[model samples]
Target: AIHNRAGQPAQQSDLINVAQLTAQYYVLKPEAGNAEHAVKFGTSGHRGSAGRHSFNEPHILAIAQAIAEERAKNGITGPCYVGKDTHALSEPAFISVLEVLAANGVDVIVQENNGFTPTPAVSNAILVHNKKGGPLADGIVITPSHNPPEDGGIKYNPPNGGPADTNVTKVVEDRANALLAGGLQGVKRISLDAAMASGHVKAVDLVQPFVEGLADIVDMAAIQKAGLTLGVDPLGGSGIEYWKRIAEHYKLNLTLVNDQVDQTFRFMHLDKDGAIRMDCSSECAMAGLLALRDKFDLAFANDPDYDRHGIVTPAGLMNPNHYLAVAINYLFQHRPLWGKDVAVGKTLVSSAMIDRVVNDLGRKLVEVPVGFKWFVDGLFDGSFGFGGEESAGASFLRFDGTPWSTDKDGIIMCLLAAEITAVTGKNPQEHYNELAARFGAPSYNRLQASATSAQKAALSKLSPEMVSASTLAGDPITARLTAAPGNGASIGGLKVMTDNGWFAARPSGTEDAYKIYCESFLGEEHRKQIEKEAVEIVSEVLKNA
Candidate 1:
């Protein structure tokens, strides 16, 4: 159930003690063989709480050492760009990573004066540098994404400038676990000061380059010339400074709704679960900025790493799905260089509205499994004009149809919203309403239920044969997919689709649970029917298993 105070501003007692959390990062130790302590990385990399023994000094040390060794073995000798966010544990983890990376004689580049860097900036820098034909560079982003204040996270981006797939993540995870089991004896390191002085670490200003390059992807001139009064709430994420620089550089009529960067994140509204998550996709979490919707023509927010975006118009906070649809509709029409051959990319779980929109536009759709990493190749090679997830995270090609950043980029998305409004004389919400009128409106929801290891395993191995149902939501079945239609990659789940509705199931990588995603183009009642049938079908399959 949603908390009574779900969208309300946080109280003093709701804040996490930053000092205590940082102390636990260094003092608390994880026992190697304990399942709770092992590094169980997901698509977002290793993320957990120091107090929970999942993210502590040893975990970071082991991960850094493992990266250093892996990079060398893979012949990646270029400078490794590292970025940290505003989280309390991030700086400590930054020091740990620097110690190991520099000790291994790996060239490392970081933000000058130890400034916070967005997830996209690091990815962008790696790509920009690697394109110069020197040694290929990679990156590490220290952020828990939209997780609660007590959490810390890290994800690796290889030279491709996107989140590492399981191919690289699994190796890092395995090596980190082995290093942890060996009591970190194989970990090499030097003092932070010595590492910084050893010439292996160099500091660079990442903002100016990224900010100056904004004009390539988004129409900054149109936004400035239109004199659009735009509002931005960075949500105290790593993009706060980038926003300031962008405002100054572009001379746009932009307002920083809230500029405070408190590690406790007390300035934010509570999430649906009454926790302090920086999830921009959550209406409850974005309530703070949504309240000031009337103050500007458009307002938006981003998650901690600035990898996700939330847009608000006078109508309300637009659903991430709605915005994604609008974004694709806008970008394809605007970026003239993005030829018809340049397809659109979306996660399979995204609303089917995108599919219809892409179809109506006569553009091919590349629908992949859940992770943004799946879109990396398509984006880099100019096959995809834009790649986005339903969770408000996305990145697109430059106006020239060249790749910008192969990772989820909230910065560019925010500007694209501004461009859409400036160029079209309508905000995203209005376009969404128009989209709903043209294509039938759709209802979508995701629910999680607990499951045992066996249930999770069985669900992960689900097949079309396991689901004997002939129809969904009273419509004849159209497709039963365990692999994505666009890429033929295992979804690690199953998706059953009818003409007017669809239901998908996937096991939680970080929890002992499974999730059911249901959407209906028919109506609310039909959506609920689909949801009900979805659970029943999965339940019957689990029972048979």
Candidate 2:
């Protein structure tokens, strides 16, 4: 069973078991998941029900023990910055994790007694500590990212200050679950009061360092110089504090359009499914920003944790994919400090239009898997100057062409829109139009389609020989690929590309479904045809498998 907003009965909308959600909430103490208990970690993090067994103290205790051991093994002696979003389960989980960390003799850090933090702020703070080489600080962030309200999660950022890679998470998760199944007897823990007394946890003000660094990576001076009016909506994430600091530091005309922070997400407009998720890029939630587009030269918003950005301009709200293309175009052309050989990063599932844009700009595209972790190698080595995913997560180098942070930074990206307008006298949407006019106006869509488990397995290994389509949506097929052209990485599906259109199909990691990402330069009708052909191609591939 499940409980939705206001303790409503469970439905299809509830994504996890009650046990997990409650366990996480037990940590937070006040939220919808206050009574549930269960393990909540998944690929994204520890995510599950907030009630029942999903998010209980036992789970958090075990998970915290795993984090402590992991850090000790890595030789990290610095404080572990702990933060949580306003989710109902986050606060209680935050307390529980701290107790465990302290009991295990790991120093902890938090945001100056205030218990709310966005996902990106935690990431940014970890990055700051690592950069300053202050005992090589790592962190644990309690969030489910863009998950629904009924869920809870925990993520770890290593000393590098980015999302912990899959390898590290696998170790933590395996050990934590083992401890949980063993009745949590081995889980080291301490009382919240005693933990505080141990002086194992330190309160760190993360806002200043992250906000102060903004000007180095984004052209804050340019935005101020151009007198561009900027507006920001935090969507009630933890980054709320940082935005005000940014405005004050940069001395710019920046507005915080929405300052309200509520755990229930009461202020959000209903999404297509009528659920409240802080996806700032959605047309529904971003309606507030879109309504006042004319008031500011550039307006931006961020999800609950502020790791991803949503941009709006006087011309229009930029599509996430289009914004990525525009950002790449702008960054490459304007960031003179970057070397000409710096590679551009994109996810394998992103639009092919980006491939066209990369070609047009004469830059190299290093395509990787869906997660942001794939870009870490490129970002660390200077092989990639900018890393972006179609889902609106991206980060780039500093103004002097050095690593700002390996993690996605919604703050900088949001501010960059203003900087673009202030420096170039054009908003991101206008710049996207210019790109479309030069490179072709392309229509893109990403949606999920149902498939059986067997079909999904088949879809993952499909080859060119399985796809019999010579022409798609009236365009001759130029290539049918099971691997990414940019890096020869397996797409775990198939992508059929043409001169004027392209479509890709990949299986969803969490569900027995397949995602079809299709694009067409010929507009909506043509794009629909591309979608139709995509289904046919997938069907054909499945038939042979």
Candidate 3:
């Protein structure tokens, strides 16, 4: 159920106590061996609240030490590129990471002048440095993404320059938990001031290199020449500096809506649950920018870490799934330099309209599970022309068919929205209309069902033989998958597909629930049928499993 204050401006009572939160991060301690506070990695990272004693000094220290050891075991000797968003806890967490890394004799690189750094910038830094044919570089991004201000998070990107796959995160998780259970005896540390003095910590410009490289990925020249007016609300994120640099470098008619940073996030509108989250894709969280859509030809925003994108036109906010379809349609047709063998990458839970779009483009579709890591290899090798998810996160190859980044880059993705209008003379919303007319405009929804995290965990281990249904929503079942068809990796749940509809069930990373992603091309009634049968099938699977 939606909250009474859902789309309204946040109140003073909604503000987080930054002073208390920061102090608690260093003072509170997680119970050793208490499973509740153990270091656990979700879809993006290990996220929790300091007030709840889940994410504190011990968690960060253990994770950082584990990553240092992971790097050594993998024979990587390059510097570790670390970045943090504007979250309040990121400040303390950054110092803890530096302290641990320097104590281990590892070289650490950070943004100049201690400025905020977006996730994409960190990914670009690692990829660019590794291309020099030397010791491989990895990165760490400290962000809880769009969660409420009370939460903190940290994610490790291995030498591959994207979200670490399960194979890597599982080891890190186990080691981190062991360190915590052992009272952090295996962890190392040094004072932040002494680490800097020891030459182990260095500051570098993370923004300039990433900003100047945008010309190769998007049509900055076209957007500049067409004089397309653009508006961007950085949402007071780590990408604030990057957005300003992009506008200045490209000479585009872009306006930076808000630029101040307040870790309490008092400037936000409450989310559907009346929490102060910075989710760019949510209609309520993005309500402020939606009201200013008429001020420009197009407007866009991103989450605090800037790994996601939200597009707005004169009409209103565009659904993320619809924008994904529009982007895939435009990219394949315009990227003439990209080889015909290059495939399109998408998560299985995203809109199936992408499958139709890729098929019409005569391109192969590599459908992986719900993580950006699955697209890293293909994007790195220039084999995936474009990769995106329904959550408004995506990245694509450069104009010359080279990998620009191996992670979801919101900066380039937002610029691509303007480039579409400048080159095609139509906004993304209009393009969506054209595609919907031809592709039957599928109805898509991602709803949550109440369940304990333990119950949700069971949903991840089911097999095809467990689902006894021969048909769904009156259509013969075509596929029942527990693993992604592209890489044969477990999808961590189940997906059932018919000729015109499908539903995928997966556990939520940060909530006591599971997500039901379903889409139907037939109509609203058929879509309802799919949702109903999906719940029944999942319920039976859980009961029997």
Candidate 4:
């Protein structure tokens, strides 16, 4: 059940105490050997809240020290670019990072005037610096990527300018835990003032170069020429200044609504769980932006770090999956400079409509497990022209078939919406309607069911032989996949597919439940049937195991 405040503007009681949270970072200390309090890096990064003792000064210090040691071990000799979002914890964590990095004799580059920097801008900086053929540079982004205002996160991007793979993250995670357990004895540190005065920390302009390079990837001139009036809600994120700079740079008709960046996020609407999540994809969280959909020809918003986008149209906010389909269809056809061999990449849990569209376009579809990191290599090599996840995070190659940013770029994706409207003379929602007419609209939903630890373990290691069921929801199952067909990577779950419908079951990384993502091209009832049977099948399999 959802809370009563769901989809409503935040109240004073719903806000977090920014001053108290920041104070706790220095006063409270996590237990030395507590696994829950240790720095743990997931697919994205190490994320937690200062009030909860998960993210604090000690955690950031250990993680930064580990990163410094790892970089030296890997022979990365260039400067490390660090960027932060608008989160209150992000400021303290950024200071922690700077102290450790400067003490280790590593050159650090940050935004000028200590301004906030988006995730994509950091990625762009790393890519551009590396392309110049000096010592390979990497980066770190201090953000939680749309989590609540109190939460803090820090992710490491390698020289490829994307999220670090498991190989790198595992090393850093292990070393960080060791340091924490050892009381951070070997962790280097220096005062923020000393670090700044040491000349190792350099403040450079990252926004201008990134904004200027927009024309190469997107048709900024065409959007301006078409006089498309656009509305943008930054959602109180790190990209608050970026949207304004983009409008001025391109001379496009753009309006910035709700520009205030309160650390408590008092302007946001509550999510389904009655928490202030800055998730741009959530209808409840995006209520503020959706209310103004008719204010402009096109409207959009981005998450705090500006790595994910939510598009709003006259038809209301478009589903993230629907926008992905529309964007893929438009990009593949419009990019004349991209090679014919460039393929489309999508996560296994994403809409199968992408598969249908790619098939109809006669392009190869590379389906991988749920993680944007899987597409980093493909994007860097220009083998995949587009890579998107169902969670609204995505990026593509430049128009010239070159790697734009090897990470999910919400900025480009949001701007591409305007370009689409200008070039096609219709909004993305209209294009999605056209695609649905051509390739049969599919209904998709994600459901959650409780799972014990043992059941989750069993589900993660399930094989086809363990499942006795031969059919799903009145249709014969054609494929029972434990790994992605395109890349043969273990999905860490099971995917059962039929002709008109499919469902993939996986255990949640942070919850005590299993997620069942099912879709159907038949109808809503059929989709419901698929969901029911999916839960039953997984339960039966776990019981038998």
Q: What is each predicted model's overall lDDT from 0 to 1?
A: 0.91, 0.77, 0.89, 0.91
Q: Tell me, by lDDT, which candidate is best.
A: 4
Q: Indicate the residue-level lDDT of 116 in model 1.
A: 93
The digit string of per-residue lDDT tens for model 2 on 316-426 reads 668898888888888888888788899899987676667887888898888776778877667766778989988898988887766776778787788777777777887
Off by over 4 Å in 4: 468-470
Per-prediction TM-score to the true structure, in the order listed: 0.96, 0.90, 0.94, 0.97
Model 2 vs truth, CA RMSD? 4.8
Count of clashes, each model: 0, 43, 0, 0
Candidate 1 stretches greater than 4 Å from native:
450-452
Candidate 4 lDDT over 434-503, as tens digits, reads: 9888877898999998888888888899887877778888999999999998789999999999988999
Write model 1 residue lDDT over 23-50, tens digit each, in one string.
9998989874579888976688899899
Worst 10 residues of 1 by lDDT: 32-41
Instruction: Give the Cα-based TM-score of candidate 2 against the true structure.
Output: 0.90
lDDT of 2: 0.77
Model 2: number of clashes?
43
For model 3, what is the error of residue 76's alpha carbon versus the real structure, in angstroms, after optimal superposition?
Answer: 1.1
For candidate 4, give the lDDT of residue 73: 93
Among all candidates shown, the one with the greatest TM-score: 4
